[PDB]
Structure formats: C-alpha cells, structure tokens
C-alpha cells in the first residue's frame, strides 16, 4: 500500500457560542483504505504560527508531494522525511500523522491506541471551560454539568481583565462550588511575572488546583521562579511548541505539569515522546486540546489511553462546542468522561454530505 493522494479541506463549523475552522485531511492509499486527520487551531494566527490557510497551502505545495509514492504502512519513515524538508509546521504534521495512523489501523484492524502500544484505559476524564464571562452564569453552568454528571472539573480563562477583577471572579466560583468541583485557571500568557507573583498566591490560597501558563514563554526564569514559589502548581502549555521544548523545560524545572497537545508537538506519536520525557523527569500530565472536532479529539485520546498516568485529566471537549459535525459517529460523553471504542483506526467515518455543505 502506497500513498496516492492527500486532500486538505478547510471546513467552517458553527459553534454553540461564531465558527470554528478545521483542516480535514484525507489520505487515500493504493489498497483502497482511506485515513482521515485533523489540523485545527484557535483564532487564525492568535494562538500559534499556523493558520487554516497556511496549513492548506503548505500541505498542497510542500508536504503532500513529498509523501505521494511512499509506503503508507511506514509511518516513521514518512514523518521523518517531513522533518527533513520542513522546519516546524507541527499542526500540519499532526493532521498528516493522524491520517496515516487511521489508515494503518483500518488496514490491520486495530484501534490507533493499539498501534501505539496498547491502551491501559477506555475512558478519559474531561474538564469543561466556563466561558460566559458572568460569574453567576458560570456557577449555574457548572451546577448543571455536575447534575447531569458530564463534568466535575472546570477551567476558567482569565487574564483579559484587570487582575483583581479576574481573581474575584475565580474565587467566587470556587467558593460557591466548594469541594464538589475542581477549579483551575488558564491565563494564556497574559500576565507578566510582576502581576503573577500576587495573583498566584491568592489563587493558590483560595483552593485553585492549578495555574496554567500564567506568564509568557519568553520569560524562562520567571517560569522557574513561579514553579518554586506558587502555592498551586504551574502547568506549561504555550511554552511547549515542540518535543525539544519539553526537554528544555524539564531540565530547567520550569513547570511541574505539562499540557500535551498533538498539534503543538507534531502528531499522536510525537505527543508520546513529550509525555515520555515528562515521565522520566517526574512531571505530571494533562491531556490538552486546540478545540478540535471529533477527528483531532479522538486522535489525541487514542494516544492518551496508552499513558501510565494523567494526574490532571484532560480537556477533550472540543466536539461539544460544535453544533454540526463532519463525521457520522458522535463521541460518548458520559459520567464525567469521554469513552473510546475498540473499533479500527480512529473509529470515525466522514459524512460526505455535511462535509460538502461546510467546506469553504
């Protein structure tokens, strides 16, 4: 089986909040097997180097031509080849690897998690981002998610308003939910070290379980200092833009927790390298997302199932934000977790009609 064609399709899907743009990859092999992958980001170029437009242009012009003709069953050789011709471009690489893994899983009749070694679990805990902006509404949404047993871990995005306004908001939510939920924050690099010093103390003293990426990745020393002084543990996300960054942060002691994202590392196998480095250093894990649809979510999930331990769970709730999907199989969210079947590949198939309807 050889790789015959690779198609990168930009799809705009409507959300429950506005749209979300996905780059769906379809890799057709000579044995008739097709693999599907996903390369998705948030806000064009605001949360990464790659935009949907940039991802497609590079796949069509550089990445895809390098793979047509190669053995579809030798994923390592294919991905190493891409590293030799292309610096970075991890989101694009992630979609490509996800698709090759899907095709290979269907070919051998095994779930991607088994291709990656074997799963140690069948479900993953999923956190939920309370994003209404209104404290009263957030507490209400949280009480609801707990009621229907969908989520018991909540994430708050802060950093866009005055520090003291965001702190009041977060402390109020943890105060009202109490021990019934785990409350965490994500500052998305918005604070400088001088603002984080007091903010991390207040949050830590008021029961916040972890503080995700409080300051910018450019401030390495600041990350090391905050890792040693904050009452609540520091998780790195944006600081990891490659597997080598993970080693660097580990060697430096810049964070006690690493967020694992297939898009930021280069695919399901790449994310496992990063996880392995963290494991060898004793750094805790968390399954992150770039708000992918079901393809990217399942591609992430299949890798996370092989991990010994994910101390802080995951946030694979991307499909729950989309009103319409492009696959036929809806993901199973039940009892605070996402459940992954033992079907071949990623266990998903495209809905040709909805795909054609939402493809731009």
Distances (CA, A) of 283 to 201, 213, 277, 354, 355: 21, 15, 9, 41, 40
What is the distance between the alpha carbons of residues 262 and 306, in angstroms, rounded to a whole number? Answer: 14
Give the CA count within 13 Å in the CB-facing half-sphere of 18.
8
Q: Which DSSP symbol is given to 179?
A: G
138 touches Mn ion by CB under 5 A: no
Interface with a copy of itself in residues 205-224 (CB under 8 A): 210, 215-216, 218-222
Distances (CA, A) of 349 to 8, 94, 102, 106: 16, 18, 10, 11
Instruction: Please tell me whether 352 is known to bind a ligand.
Output: no
We find the least distance from the C-beta atom of residue 327 to a copy of itself, in angstroms, to be: 26
Residue window 129-168: x/- pattern of binding to a copy of itself, with contact defined by CB under 8 A: -----------------------------------x----
292 touches Mn ion by CB under 5 A: no
Residue 14: which H helix or E strand, with range?
strand 3-14
> 35 CB contacts (<8 Å, ≥6 apart)?
26, 27, 29, 72, 98, 99, 100, 101, 102, 103, 104, 106, 345
Instruction: Please tell me whether 237 is known to bind a ligand.
Output: yes
Q: By three-state DSSP, how is residue 184 classified? A: strand
We find the least distance from the C-beta atom of residue 184 to a copy of itself, in angstroms, to be: 12
**34-40/19-29 β-pairing:** antiparallel
Residue window 181-200: x/- pattern of binding to Mn ion, with contact defined by CB under 5 A: -----x--------------
284 contact, one of a copy of itself, Mn ion, none, CB 5-8 Å limit per kind: a copy of itself
We find the least distance from the C-beta atom of residue 239 to Mn ion, in angstroms, to be: 10
We find the least distance from the C-beta atom of residue 213 to Mn ion, in angstroms, to be: 5
Residue window 270-309: x/- pattern of binding to a copy of itself, with contact defined by CB under 8 A: ---x--xx--xxxxx---------------------x-x-
125 contact, one of Mn ion, a copy of itself, none, CB 5-8 Å limit per kind: none
> 164 CB contacts (<8 Å, ≥6 apart)?
none
What is the number of H-type helices and E-type strands within the chain?
A: 14, 13
Interface with a copy of itself in residues 26-65 (CB under 8 A): 44-49, 51, 53-54, 56-58, 60-62
Instruction: Please tell me whether 166 is known to bind a ligand.
Output: no
What is the distance between the alpha carbons of residues 99 and 94, in angstroms, rounded to a whole number? Answer: 9
Strand partners, 129: 155
237 contact, one of Mn ion, a copy of itself, none, CB 5-8 Å limit per kind: Mn ion
The residues annotated with a catalytic role in the active site are 157, 315
> 174 CB contacts (<8 Å, ≥6 apart)?
183, 206, 207, 208
341 touches a copy of itself by CB under 8 A: no
257 contact, one of Mn ion, a copy of itself, none, CB 5-8 Å limit per kind: a copy of itself
Considering only 251, 334, 335, 359, the residue that binds a copy of itself (CB under 8 A) is: 251
What is the distance between the alpha carbons of residues 21 and 15, in angstroms, rounded to a whole number? Answer: 10
Phi-psi region of 28 (alpha: psi -120 to 50; beta: other; left: phi over 0): beta
Positive or negative, the Cα torsion across 343, 344, 345, 348? negative
102 touches Mn ion by CB under 5 A: no
We find the least distance from the C-beta atom of residue 182 to Mn ion, in angstroms, to be: 16
256 touches a copy of itself by CB under 8 A: yes
Interface with Mn ion in residues 214-253 (CB under 5 A): 237
160 contact, one of a copy of itself, Mn ion, none, CB 5-8 Å limit per kind: none
23-31, 112-120, 287-295, 329-337 -> range binding a copy of itself (CB under 8 A): 112-120
User: Which residues are at the interface with Mn ion (CB under 5 A)?
Assistant: 186, 212, 237
| Sequence ranges of the binding site for Mn(2+) | 186, 212, 237
| Sequence ranges of the binding site | 186, 212, 237
């Amino acid at each position: 089986a050889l790789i015959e064609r690779i198609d990168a399709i930009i799809v705009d899907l409507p959300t429950i909040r506005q749209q979300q743009t996905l780059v769906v990859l379809r890799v057709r092999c000579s044995d008739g097997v097709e693999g599907i992958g996903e390369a998705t980001t948030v806000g064009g170029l605001a949360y990464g180097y790659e935009s949907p437009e940039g991802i497609k242009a590079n796949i069509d012009a550089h990445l895809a031509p390098a793979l047509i003709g190669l053995a579809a069953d030798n994923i390592n050789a294919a991905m190493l080849k891409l590293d030799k011709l292309a610096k970075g471009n991890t989101f694009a690489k992630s979609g490509i690897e996800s698709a090759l893994l899907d095709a290979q899983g269907k070919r051998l009749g095994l779930p991607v998690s088994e291709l990656l070694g074997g799963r140690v679990r069948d479900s993953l805990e999923v956190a939920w981002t309370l994003a209404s902006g209104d404290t009263a509404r957030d507490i209400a949404e949280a009480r609801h998610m707990l009621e229907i047993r969908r989520h018991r871990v909540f994430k708050l995005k802060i950093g866009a308003n005055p520090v003291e306004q965001d702190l009041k908001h977060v402390v109020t939510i943890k105060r009202e939910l109490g021990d019934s939920a785990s409350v965490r924050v994500d500052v998305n690099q918005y604070w400088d070290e001088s603002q984080a010093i007091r903010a991390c103390q207040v949050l830590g003293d008021n029961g916040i379980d972890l503080i995700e990426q409080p300051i910018s990745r450019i401030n390495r020393g600041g990350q090391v200092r905050l890792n040693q002084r904050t009452p609540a543990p520091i998780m790195a996300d944006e600081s990891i833009e490659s597997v080598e960054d993970a080693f660097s942060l580990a060697a430096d002691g810049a964070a006690s927790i690493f967020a694992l994202k297939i898009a930021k590392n280069g695919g399901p196998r790449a994310v496992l390298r990063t996880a392995q480095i963290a494991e060898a250093a004793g750094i805790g894990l968390y399954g992150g997302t770039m708000l992918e649809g079901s393809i990217g979510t399942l591609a992430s999930a299949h890798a996370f199932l092989t991990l010994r331990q994910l101390t802080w769970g995951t946030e694979l709730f991307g499909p729950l934000l989309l009103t319409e999907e492009i696959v036929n199989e809806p993901p199973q969210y039940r009892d605070f977790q996402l459940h992954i079947p033992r079907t071949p590949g990623l266990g998903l198939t495209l809905d040709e009609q909805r795909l054609a309807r939402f493809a731009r």
